[PDB]
Design a protein around this ligand. Structure first.
Ligand SMILES: *[C@@H]1O[C@H](CO)[C@@H](O[C@@H]2O[C@H](CO)[C@@H](O[C@@H]3O[C@H](CO)[C@@H](O)[C@H](O)[C@@H]3O)[C@H](O)[C@H]2NC(C)=O)[C@H](O)[C@H]1NC(C)=O
Ligand SMILES: *[C@@H]1O[C@H](CO)[C@@H](O[C@@H]2O[C@H](CO)[C@@H](O[C@@H]3O[C@H](CO)[C@@H](O)[C@H](O)[C@@H]3O)[C@H](O)[C@H]2NC(C)=O)[C@H](O)[C@H]1NC(C)=O
Ligand SMILES: *[C@@H]1O[C@H](CO)[C@@H](O[C@@H]2O[C@H](CO)[C@@H](O[C@@H]3O[C@H](CO)[C@@H](O)[C@H](O)[C@@H]3O)[C@H](O)[C@H]2NC(C)=O)[C@H](O)[C@H]1NC(C)=O
Ligand SMILES: *[C@@H]1O[C@H](CO)[C@@H](O[C@@H]2O[C@H](CO)[C@@H](O)[C@H](O)[C@H]2NC(C)=O)[C@H](O)[C@H]1NC(C)=O
Ligand SMILES: *[C@@H]1O[C@H](CO)[C@@H](O[C@@H]2O[C@H](CO)[C@@H](O)[C@H](O)[C@H]2NC(C)=O)[C@H](O)[C@H]1NC(C)=O
Ligand SMILES: *[C@@H]1O[C@H](CO)[C@@H](O[C@@H]2O[C@H](CO)[C@@H](O)[C@H](O)[C@H]2NC(C)=O)[C@H](O)[C@H]1NC(C)=O
Ligand SMILES: CC(=O)N[C@@H]1[C@@H](O)[C@H](O)[C@@H](CO)O[C@H]1O
Ligand SMILES: *[C@@H]1O[C@H](CO)[C@@H](O)[C@H](O)[C@H]1NC(C)=O
Ligand SMILES: *[C@@H]1O[C@H](CO)[C@@H](O)[C@H](O)[C@H]1NC(C)=O
Lengths: 454, 454, 454
């Protein structure tokens, strides 16, 4: 990686990442088969097979009141985002589910899987899904369990059938309670909905080129992490559900992250403070720049960053000029201002930015040595090669130990160009040139008053 | 449903929903009985019964250090909300728990269930709760297990008792680890705290009319979804806990949702942008209107929307005139402004609102025939009977496929009345009439300077 | 506790808490041993041992594609916070994990545990961790399972080995599931990562005085609640992972909480409204004051509060003067303003603050008696000793029943000082003295025009 400390805007920009962007969803439709349990009875009394069999029958009866979408009746850019990714994900899932719930669709899907256990099918709206069938419990019930229970006797002396049936209905019971606890729309794929072999077999079928397929096949955990399952229904004795997986269609494209801390200048005891408000992630793609402002939707693993294209905002390319000359650009650089200092530590991938003002004591130290030194007032960039912990008055922060190259870009701070008297009041996500306009307009009105003497 | 696209404010309002509002809590008190495992020993050596029995004893000894409310010494309306619902829920739960932890209360509760397994009791503060007892592990320990383990031997050749005991203590061990892992206050009801039959038997006892009782009995999943459990304690060998369930007292009352996207007008290359800020849900009730501003607390299931009355804000009845006459109403309709366009897509229940400005390319297409057409600059409303996917420069969004009636309400945009020069700086949740006040005050001051000639 | 209702600022301050502050992390390194399962085969067909053994082998094969940090190629103070605590926690965890993944480190750690099952070791960077080994499945496989399965026969008539092996590999399969579902970094410690006895043994070894050790040993649930586990890898047949636990180094230090609700004054039908914006928690420590603005990071159990020093902001000790003299302090008291009333209820630990305005009906009542009385317009403080529920037009809130001493402080509201005409537009987190300066500047300009007559 490579990290620059920008003295002027008092912030830091770290480059050298590579993106892995989600660009669509892939749907797997699972048909879990249970068999003819609702046709088997027991009359001996208390036993093991009877307990397990009553659990299975009750699970089927319970799952028929759970519905994913039906009621059974028998400019602050960090705020414009924040709720887009999940809303879009759920909207797409329910939109496909509405199409699979029809009787013609389920009939076609079950006819595909009549003689196999996986088949690629096309729904009625032209979408291609992958249908797969789970048939272990059904085969055990038809071939083994039913033969043993002949005359409604279940207090038999086998006890191998009892333990076997306990082994075989575990996945079914787990699927049922995961859908029943979560109102029919789970928020993550467990190992009961989609196990590991089926995750690999679904990744091998996605509609992308070979490079992305290789990346996902090797890092399946991060493809399972961003999916969810939706219940379709209980048809006959089959529990039908679906699983939505991401498609990381665009890989290895530039990214960078911007971090910042307050920049405050003092004169005669009065302060003038700014703070850059365009922090977060930026990703290039096909010549266009996308800004992800809520850092809870991008996840790094190494120097790769996994991102969600539905949670970003398109920004012009001239937006990379706030990192070169924040003061005299044309782009509307976003800043927040104030008249009261804040002391804080903003950790960045290769170090920290410490802001130490009027009444706070800061220091840097290591593990084997202890307090290495103190720090002067103002803002400082502490690389993670010269320190291990950074201390504000009593708080200790542990720097991350990533390896990279650090640079410092010289320049007198912008906050030192103001007069702490005549500074405008507090602002929230304005452009910097509007701050300069406020000051200029006040000067102009005072001059207008002064010219008029008479 | 029915959705209108409002041109002047550049937003959309969807009506025809029906509410299901939470209006209180119902409390179930569970007494889970374990028996005299604490005075059963073993001396043979490793076996199955010994392993299971050590697990049960350790679970009891573990649960006695877990406490839920003691330490053992042995005007931006989206910000005023956001934390009310969950804080109120926990406050009510702990307020009742403080009353059940007394020894007189637990004595009375255990005396109610002496000869039955469910009884409605009244606490000391006049609240009526439902007390229920779970007695399967205890009966197994007293009747079956104790007789077999007679001379401190457990390496017996039965092995039906070992498997039975493993079946019987599963619920106890699950309850214990759910409370131990969550500090004593779980955030959701599992099938171990309260199973399905007990959920139905508690819904049948709530203090509401028959219509709401019918709705809740048929949609139990969404009544379990909004509860939580609190540990009361370990008394003797009984684990006593409680479960809080919602009471959806008010059903089938009008609701609507409001969505919006930026509305920007260009003159000589300078933009004036305005965005509507009163988005989210609104519900009538008894002639009053309640505005739910955080869309994370209202959840739809078809025509109906499930809402939490503690997370809403009472708004005036004229707040629905911002959807008719946004410029000339007396009501203070909230807007945000700016001078820099944003391009984005705001998905509404029957379509999308696309805002496409200076440097972004947009298109609409479907699943079968691919890209259908491009879009002109500005903001436009795209129904979901017209397209399937909407594309911003490289992002693709899949519309929801709900069925309804879409209307368009004509009008010249508000943003086309401003002069992009002489536009006020960025604002955040101001009323629109204050924007007009800023412009008029500046005009008047300039006129005052111009009149004075001398 | 003790709670004051401040009438001038229309807010409430509750004191008498004691803090339990986190000041560092402690690392446990677990080595879970599986044995030579990948060396055992079966050739009889279906049985119980074969099913369990295939599950164990598949778990090992599955866990080798999960990575916690690598990609396999094989001034609004409430916004400046909000993401510091979790980012810092994960940064520290991954920083230590990068050091334990080296082969020299794992070799040294495994050499410590050669002849014992717990040992305190020091890594290569000087940090001291606690290494512990889990050896039950491995000993069962070497001593019992391997001998019985002699010539690839597993359809044997034991059935005690089958149940025993089901009992023994449960913890291993659960650990593998928890790391595989969560991409290799779980967000909480379950009872499978670190059980209870090992939590007690890790707390006994922390680097703090005896008093903090005693507090943590007695309230272990709240120490497990704030940790997480990270996967280090699979080495041979050993699954190596780590667990990060908090160190509550500073205990029993003063805290207080500040709550507030809108304060609006009416004249001739026009309202001037003011709301106080420095709400949340405050803690002393060593003569400094720390302000925690996001209430989601501080959690109370009794009159104790479990804060997190990485999520707070250092504030000057004159900040408390906002609770005594909000108008004339020499301190930037943060307020929001408006011209439209809001009616709402802010629940404070010993009562509620009800704001009732233009068109809202409020009342207070109890359980046994019902509606006790109505409330006048304005803001009022309802202690939790003369009421149980507070009702806004149709919403009912249940007060908390904590016991303390309530105390009202006299004074005329600040909002009665303003003129509802000539009130500045809506503000958001400005200092109060800036509002006064705004009004004064407007008066001065009007006077300047009035003086000039000519
Ligand atoms: C644990 O102990 C209980 C009670 O000691 C056992 O329940 C007993 O099961 C027998 C089964 O023979 C039942 O008695 C008889 O039931 C048959 C029909 O199954 C019928 O001929 C009569 O109705 C007769 O009463 C009864 O449920 C019960 N016996 C008594 C005396 O209560 C249970 O089986 C034991 N469980 C295990 C796993 O050992
Ligand atoms: C549940 O039922 C299935 C099928 O009834 C059982 O699978 C069968 O298990 C037997 C066990 O011996 C296998 O027999 C084998 O026959 C072949 C052909 O001669 C030969 O390799 C041996 O002589 C061996 O005995 C059989 O292949 C296998 N499958 C079928 C279709 O019969 C299964 O064991 C039962 N499970 C339980 C727990 O009862
Ligand atoms: C797994 O393997 C171990 C080791 O082979 C088995 O443990 C064995 O259990 C016997 C029980 O008979 C124990 O023998 C000892 O005998 C003396 C004298 O009777 C007594 O004082 C001890 O307390 C103990 O009972 C011993 O733990 C062990 N035998 C050895 C090491 O020779 C264990 O049974 C196996 N697990 C299963 C499920 O088979
Ligand atoms: C259990 O047995 C009953 C028969 O007593 C089955 O019910 C019939 O099954 C056939 C098979 O297709 C249908 O054609 C009949 O219409 C069924 N009868 C009724 C009244 O519906 C029942 O299906 C069996 N259980 C299962 C799970 O198949
Ligand atoms: C051991 O089992 C007995 C069953 O009778 C439990 O009852 C107590 O037994 C002790 C004798 O050790 C008596 O002194 C007590 O008076 C009995 N209890 C009562 C209420 O009378 C006993 O609790 C069990 N032991 C443990 C430790 O639980
Ligand atoms: C199961 O057996 C194989 C083959 O014996 C083990 O692989 C190595 O085999 C060589 C002989 O070619 C031995 O010298 C090594 O010692 C074996 N490896 C080890 C780690 O001992 C294989 O390792 C065995 N399974 C396990 C889990 O060790
Ligand atoms: C008015 C002005 O100074 N504009 C410059 C711009 O030309 C330059 O491209 C940018 C950084 O390269 O810095 C700024
Ligand atoms: C704006 O339209 C609403 C719609 O009925 C109307 O009631 C209101 O009087 C209008 N505002 C005016 C006329 O200033
Ligand atoms: C306001 O009250 C505080 C409370 O002690 C006091 O210290 C301060 O001096 C007061 N303000 C002025 C201007 O005196």
């Amino acid at each position: 990686l490579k990290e620059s400390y920008l003295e002027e805007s008092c912030s830091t920009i770290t480059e050298g990442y590579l993106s892995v962007l989600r660009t669509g969803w892939y749907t797997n439709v699972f048909t879990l088969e249970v068999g003819d349990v609702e046709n088997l009875t027991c009359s001996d009394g208390p036993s093991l097979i009877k307990t397990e069999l009553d659990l299975t029958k009750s699970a089927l009866r319970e799952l028929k009141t759970v519905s994913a979408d039906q009621l059974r009746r028998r400019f602050v850019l960090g705020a414009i985002a924040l709720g887009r990714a999940t809303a879009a994900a759920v909207t797409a899932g329910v939109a496909i589910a509405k199409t699979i719930r029809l009787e013609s669709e389920v009939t076609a899907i079950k006819n595909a899987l009549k003689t196999t256990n996986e088949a690629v099918s096309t729904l009625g709206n032209g979408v291609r899904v992958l249908a797969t069938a789970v048939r272990e419990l059904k085969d055990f019930v038809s071939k083994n369990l039913t033969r043993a229970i002949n005359k409604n006797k279940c207090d038999i002396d086998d006890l191998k059938m009892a333990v076997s049936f306990s082994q075989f209905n575990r996945r079914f019971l787990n699927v049922v309670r995961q859908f029943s606890e979560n109102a029919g729309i789970t928020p993550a794929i467990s190992l009961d909905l989609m196990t590991d072999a089926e995750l690999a077999r679904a990744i091998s079928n996605m509609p992308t080129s070979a490079g992305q397929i290789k990346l996902m096949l090797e890092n399946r955990a991060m493809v399972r992490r961003k999916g969810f399952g939706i219940l379709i229904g209980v048809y006959g004795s089959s529990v039908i559900y679906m699983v939505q997986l991401p498609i990381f269609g665009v890989i290895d494209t530039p990214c960078w992250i911007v971090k910042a801390a307050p920049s405050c200048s003092e004169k005669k005891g009065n302060y003038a403070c700014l703070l850059r408000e365009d922090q977060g992630w930026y990703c290039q793609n096909a010549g266009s720049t996308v800004y992800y402002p809520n850092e809870k939707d991008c996840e790094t693993r190494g120097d790769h960053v996994f991102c969600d294209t539905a949670a970003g905002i398109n920004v012009a390319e001239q937006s990379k000029e706030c990192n070169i000359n924040i003061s005299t650009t044309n782009y509307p650089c976003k800043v927040s201002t104030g008249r009261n200092p804040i002391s804080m530590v903003a950790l960045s991938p290769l170090g920290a930015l410490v802001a130490c003002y009027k009444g706070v004591s800061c220091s840097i130290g290591s593990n084997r040595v202890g307090i290495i030194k103190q720090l002067n007032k103002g803002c400082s960039y502490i690389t993670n090669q010269d320190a291990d912990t950074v201390t504000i008055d009593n708080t200790v922060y542990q720097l991350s130990k990533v390896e990279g190259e650090q640079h410092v870009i010289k320049g007198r701070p912008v906050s030192s160009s103001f007069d702490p008297i005549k500074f405008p009041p507090d602002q929230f996500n304005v452009a910097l040139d509007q701050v300069f306009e406020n000051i200029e307009n006040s000067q102009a009105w005072v001059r207008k008053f002064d010219e008029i003497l008479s």
